[PDB]
Amino acid sequence: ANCTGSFDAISASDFVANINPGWNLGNSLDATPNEDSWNNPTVQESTFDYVKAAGFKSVRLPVTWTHHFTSESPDWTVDPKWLQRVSDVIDMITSRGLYTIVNVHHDSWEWADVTKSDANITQIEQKFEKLWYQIGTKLACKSSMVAFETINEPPCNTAEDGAKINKFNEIFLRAINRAGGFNAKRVVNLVGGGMDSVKTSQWFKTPANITNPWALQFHFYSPYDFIFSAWGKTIWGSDSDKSELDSTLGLLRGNFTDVPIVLGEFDASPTNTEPAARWKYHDYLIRSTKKYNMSPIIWDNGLDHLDRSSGIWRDPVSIEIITNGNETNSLPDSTVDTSAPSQSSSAYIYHKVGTEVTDQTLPFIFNDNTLVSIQDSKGTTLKADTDYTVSGSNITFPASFLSTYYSETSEPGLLPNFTLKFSSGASPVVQLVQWDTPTLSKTSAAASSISGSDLSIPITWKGLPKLATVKALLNNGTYLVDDFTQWFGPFGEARTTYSNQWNWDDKNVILTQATVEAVVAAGQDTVFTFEFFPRVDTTTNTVNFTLTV
Numbered sequence: 001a002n003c004t005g006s007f008d009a010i011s012a013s014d015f016v017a018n019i020n021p022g023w024n025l026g027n028s029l030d031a032t033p034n035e036d037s038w039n040n041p042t043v044q045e046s047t048f049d050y051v052k053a054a055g056f057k058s059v060r061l062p063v064t065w066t067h068h069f070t071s072e073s074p075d076w077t078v079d080p081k082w083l084q085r086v087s088d089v090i091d092m093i094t095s096r097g098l099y100t101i102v103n104v105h106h107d108s109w110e111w112a113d114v115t116k117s118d119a120n121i122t123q124i125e126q127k128f129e130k131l132w133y134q135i136g137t138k139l140a141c142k143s144s145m146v147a148f149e150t151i152n153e154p155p156c157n158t159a160e161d162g163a164k165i166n167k168f169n170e171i172f173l174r175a176i177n178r179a180g181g182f183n184a185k186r187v188v189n190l191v192g193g194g195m196d197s198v199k200t201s202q203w204f205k206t207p208a209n210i211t212n213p214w215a216l217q218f219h220f221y222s223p224y225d226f227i228f229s230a231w232g233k234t235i236w237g238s239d240s241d242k243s244e245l246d247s248t249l250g251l252l253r254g255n256f257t258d259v260p261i262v263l264g265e266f267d268a269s270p271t272n273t274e275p276a277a278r279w280k281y282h283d284y285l286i287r288s289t290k291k292y293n294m295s296p297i298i299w300d301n302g303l304d305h306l307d308r309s310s311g312i313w314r315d316p317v318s319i320e321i322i323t324n325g326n327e328t329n330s331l332p333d334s335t336v337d338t339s340a341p342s343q344s345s346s347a348y349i350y351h352k353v354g355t356e357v358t359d360q361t362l363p364f365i366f367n368d369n370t371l372v373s374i375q376d377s378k379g380t381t382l383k384a385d386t387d388y389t390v391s392g393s394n395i396t397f398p399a400s401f402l403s404t405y406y407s408e409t410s411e412p413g414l415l416p417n418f419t420l421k422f423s424s425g426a427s428p429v430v431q432l433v434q435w436d437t438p439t440l441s442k443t444s445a446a447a448s449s450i451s452g453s454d455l456s457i458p459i460t461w462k463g464l465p466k467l468a469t470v471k472a473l474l475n476n477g478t479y480l481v482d483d484f485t486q487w488f489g490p491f492g493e494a495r496t497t498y499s500n501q502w503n504w505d506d507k508n509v510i511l512t513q514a515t516v517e518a519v520v521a522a523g524q525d526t527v528f529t530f531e532f533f534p535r536v537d538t539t540t541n542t543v544n545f546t547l548t549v
């Protein structure tokens with residue numbers, strides 16, 4: 001490829017500086033087999049208007065090439081129509097002033113997996129170089145506002161596998177420069193094993209005689225328990241929570257001191273996380289990435305944050321924290337003690353159906369900001385010191401005010417929410433929820449009979465239509481899975497993990513098929529306790545389902 005225009009070379013130091021913060025076009029060009037094969041529609045350019053409008057400077061563009069080869073060995077030719085769509089998407093992003101990073105995505109485990117026992121590594125190395133040569137040529141003439149990323153979370157388990165990770169970086173660089181254009185001065189992102197901080201710290205080595213301006217990219221989905229909703233962990237924000245996060249990011253930067261560091265994916269998704277812990281986590285992540293000179297990019301698979309169809313951010317409180325990292329935000333407080341028998345969150349006004357309406361006190365972490373005003377989701381501004389009262393970290397709400405939203409007999413569900421405008425930082429939102437214990441359409445079932453697939457139990461949600469976690473106990477008292485949760489406190493013992501074991505939708509609570517075969521295998525009746533928010537205790541806001549055997 002030959003390029004007719006000019007190219008403003010940018011340094012890796014400057015590139016990462018100007019991309020902060022970023023957002024992912026998730027489950028789009030990375031979907032399999034086609035871009036709308038998963039949860040997302042055909043990509044539309046308006047989406048990038050929203051990303052710009054919400055304050056992001058850059059867009060990371062994951063692309064799965066696995067299903068877009070028109071020839072096999074040797075040529076391994078990629079469809080020109082796909083290369084054209086990828087090229088056009090990059091144009092939509094840059095032409096709205098957003099920086100771009102494009103990659104080879106789920107090819108990482110679909111065919112580029114070197115840890116698999118039968119992996120033809122010579123055929124992998126060829127197919128990778130054939131691929132980046134074709135990507136390189138088509139994008140060879142793109143402005144410096146486009147960067148190339150080697151490969152997404154590449155499987156890696158050994159020091160021996162890590163050298164194969166570094167080789168992926170070399171094959172990639174030799175292909176992109178042989179493709180010509182502006183690529184010899186294009187910014188690139190090299191990767192380590194699994195894009196894990198430690199695997200990269202343990203095994204990553206910089207390619208010898210490298211000439212492209214380059215930065216390092218890693219992903220952060222830690223701590224596993226809170227981020228993935230495992231073992232009943234529904235709280236984050238303790239001093240140990242903070243030290244462990246700061247420790248993970250600090251040992252990476254300590255290994256790679258003068259290297260620009262891109263945090264390519266991160267997400268405490270509003271789908272599964274409790275809001276106050278979620279907002280505390282993103283605040284301390286942005287705070288951490290700034291301390292270690294790292295530019296973050298949030299993962300958004302289309303459902304976690306931006307609704308592309310409306311321009312509405314589902315979690316606008318988060319978005320403001322990442323897009324204005326130079327401000328101190330005051331956040332609602334929440335339980336962070338792993339041994340507490342009750343859990344609270346200042347992101348909610350909870351009221352139980354059939355109880356008297358009482359005053360509600362929500363502790364906030366003001367962080368030297370002052371409260372300016374409060375606004376409900378119906379447009380009325382609340383009257384200070386009559387409709388709500390501040391005392392230090394407490395923000396107290398009169399029963400007479402709250403009765404103007406719910407009663408002892410009013411319907412259960414989500415009520416309006418309060419948006420609290422502070423002197424600086426993001427403006428957190430408190431959600432009023434009228435809640436009762438949900439009821440299920442079934443209370444027991446023969447594991448044998450319900451076998452086949454996942455077990456859907458229709459549920460009457462009452463309040464928050466989210467499932468918090470599930471307890472799993474055999475009849476003789478042994479835990480169904482993961483014995484080690486016995487050290488996880490009143491809300492963690494015998495609890496199971498989101499998606500793997502339990503799930504939910506609009507009309508059901510879901511036990512995955514794998515859970516049932518753990519009950520069938522255990523061979524004794526198992527009590528599953530579905531738990532919901534608020535977790536006022538381990539028993540009130542719960543409902544039992546038993547699998548007989």
Ligand SMILES: *[C@@H]1O[C@H](CO)[C@@H](O[C@@H]2O[C@H](CO)[C@@H](O[C@@H]3O[C@H](CO[C@H]4O[C@H](CO[C@H]5O[C@H](CO)[C@@H](O)[C@H](O)[C@@H]5O)[C@@H](O)[C@H](O[C@H]5O[C@H](CO)[C@@H](O)[C@H](O)[C@@H]5O)[C@@H]4O)[C@@H](O)[C@H](O)[C@@H]3O)[C@H](O)[C@H]2NC(C)=O)[C@H](O)[C@H]1NC(C)=O
Nearest residue numbers: 473475476477478493494527529538539540541542543544
């Ligand atoms: C969903 O189902 C739940 C279980 O089916 C049900 O919870 C049960 O509720 C009843 C009624 O209140 C409780 O009965 C009360 O129990 C106490 C003594 O309880 C303590 O000891 C029992 C018995 O332990 C012995 O047997 C087990 C056999 O599995 C052996 O391991 C053990 O070594 C003993 O020999 C024990 O089950 C209890 O343990 C529960 O609570 C502890 C402490 O929090 C947890 O660590 C543990 O996970 C477990 O949940 C308990 O320590 C007695 O004094 C009272 O008079 C009364 O009889 C049951 O204890 C309780 N059972 C369980 C397994 O929780 C829920 O009510 C129901 N929920 C809904 C919404 O319907």
Ligand SMILES: *[C@@H]1O[C@H](CO)[C@@H](O[C@@H]2O[C@H](CO)[C@@H](O[C@@H]3O[C@H](CO)[C@@H](O)[C@H](O[C@H]4O[C@H](CO)[C@@H](O)[C@H](O)[C@@H]4O[C@H]4O[C@H](CO)[C@@H](O)[C@H](O)[C@@H]4O)[C@@H]3O)[C@H](O)[C@H]2NC(C)=O)[C@H](O)[C@H]1NC(C)=O
Nearest residue numbers: 039040041302303307308309310312313314377417429431
């Ligand atoms: C405070 O209270 C207010 C209520 O007054 C809350 O505001 C509502 O928030 C929700 C979530 O942000 C929002 O619902 C979306 O509104 C749009 C209608 O204008 C729709 O575009 C959208 O549907 C998509 O999103 C759903 C939930 O996110 C998906 O379940 C659904 O399938 C839709 O997704 C389709 O399209 C996407 C495109 O990417 C694709 O991935 C999917 O496959 C699918 O095809 C929602 O209905 C409400 O509109 C908001 N209401 C108002 C008045 O603005 C606010 O969130 C509260 N704050 C809290 C709780 O913190």
Ligand SMILES: *[C@@H]1O[C@H](CO)[C@@H](O[C@@H]2O[C@H](CO)[C@@H](O[C@@H]3O[C@H](CO)[C@@H](O)[C@H](O[C@H]4O[C@H](CO)[C@@H](O)[C@H](O)[C@@H]4O)[C@@H]3O)[C@H](O)[C@H]2NC(C)=O)[C@H](O)[C@H]1NC(C)=O
Nearest residue numbers: 197198199200201202203247248250251252253254255256
């Ligand atoms: C560059 O990165 C590498 C890789 O991340 C990093 O080396 C790692 O350092 C950490 C600590 O900095 C080591 O973790 C220790 O591991 C052993 C077990 O192997 C334990 O003895 C230690 O635990 C102590 O403290 C714990 C706190 O929870 C307690 O559990 C315990 O009681 C102990 O007192 C500790 O966790 C880790 O093993 C190494 N990894 C390797 C492969 O060497 C290195 O420090 C980084 N360098 C720089 C300059 O940043």
Ligand SMILES: OC[C@H]1O[C@@H](O[C@H]2[C@H](O)[C@@H](O)[C@H](O)O[C@@H]2CO[C@H]2OC[C@@H](O)[C@H](O)[C@H]2O)[C@H](O)[C@@H](O)[C@@H]1O
Nearest residue numbers: 026027037038039040106109153299300301302304
């Ligand atoms: O729900 C729509 C599709 O979701 C797919 O899961 C996506 C998630 O939405 C995304 O947030 C997450 O980061 O990636 C997965 C993609 O799944 C793949 O992840 C990497 C590999 O290790 C996994 O084996 C692989 O499955 C889901 O895969 C689809 O089934 C849904 O249509």
Ligand SMILES: *[C@@H]1O[C@H](CO)[C@@H](O)[C@H](O)[C@H]1NC(C)=O
Nearest residue numbers: 073074120121122123124126
């Ligand atoms: C591995 O791939 C190479 C290159 O495509 C091919 O020539 C070779 O036959 C394959 N080897 C095995 C053992 O499958």
Ligand SMILES: *[C@@H]1O[C@H](CO)[C@@H](O)[C@H](O)[C@H]1NC(C)=O
Nearest residue numbers: 361363390391392393394395
């Ligand atoms: C905050 O609220 C708690 C419980 O409502 C109370 O014990 C504490 O003294 C309050 N602090 C104030 C009002 O400054």
Ligand SMILES: *[C@@H]1O[C@H](CO)[C@@H](O)[C@H](O)[C@H]1NC(C)=O
Nearest residue numbers: 474476477478521522523524
């Ligand atoms: C409970 O039953 C399981 C079934 O496999 C068995 O392995 C376990 O040892 C039993 N333990 C107790 C304490 O009854």
Ligand SMILES: *[C@H]1O[C@H](CO)[C@@H](O)[C@H](O)[C@@H]1O
Nearest residue numbers: 335341342343344345536
């Ligand atoms: C948070 O506050 C609630 C009251 O709203 C308590 O029930 C809980 O124990 C925690 O202190």
